[PDB]
């Protein structure tokens, strides 16, 4: 709908462990497009928060492992669009990405949506036990902090469906990708 540009992206370990996003995403992620930005937190500075609040008036900021000062912002939050319940948090509870623990915490949350920060930046996807398993990834796949895909997808949520537009900025020479691998909630 372009009023639902639901995107899991970013995560450059900033300002500590990167410098900044190149102009490619910067213009690709500039104001004027997105009305609903999906934040993955742990930026970790304030100026990027400002910029992301600028990307859309609809965000979901979270405290991460590198997020100390705002002791207040808890780590989990769920939102719902229609019949889809978008739950998300750090994943600290996890010792490994064991699907049992994943789906169990999801049931604690009553959600089918998957967003976290593990240890590695490694994507995989498949179906098992009524739920689908999607890695929130990073902007272009920064280094090892989240159980390496450039994660960003023009995602509209409808009913039980999310139109996952699998897009990457892949090096060969980082280059923009327009592809789609969509999943809708089984219910």
């Amino acid at each position: 709908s372009m009023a639902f540009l639901i995107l899991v992206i970013g995560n450059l370990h900033i300002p500590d462990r990167a410098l900044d996003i190149p102009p490619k995403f910067k213009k690709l992620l500039s104001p004027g497009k997105i009305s609903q930005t999906l934040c993955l937190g742990n930026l970790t500075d304030r100026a990027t928060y400002d910029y992301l609040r600028s990307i859309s008036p609809d965000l979901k900021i979270v405290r991460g492992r590198m997020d100390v000062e705002a002791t207040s912002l808890p780590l989990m939050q769920v939102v719902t669009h229609g019949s889809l319940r978008i739950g998300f948090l750090e994943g600290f509870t996890l010792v490994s990405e064991e699907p049992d623990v994943l789906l169990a915490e999801a049931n604690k949350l009553d959600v089918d949506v998957l967003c976290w920060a593990g240890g590695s930046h490694r994507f995989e996807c498949f179906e098992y036990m009524d739920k689908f398993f999607v890695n929130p990834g990073s902007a272009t796949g920064a280094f090892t902090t989240d159980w390496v895909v450039p994660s960003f997808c023009l995602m509209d949520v409808q009913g039980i469906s999310l139109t996952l537009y699998v897009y990457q900025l892949r090096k060969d020479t980082e280059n923009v990708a327009v592809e789609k691998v969509t999943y809708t909630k089984p219910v």
Binding site: I14, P15, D16, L19, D45, R46
Partner: peptide, 19 residues
């Protein structure tokens, strides 16, 4: 107020990175 982050927040970030 870190209206300058006085001053080098991004400056030290870029510094340590270009290192």
């Amino acid at each position: 107020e870190t209206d300058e982050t006085m001053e080098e927040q991004g400056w030290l970030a870029r510094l340590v990175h270009l290192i």
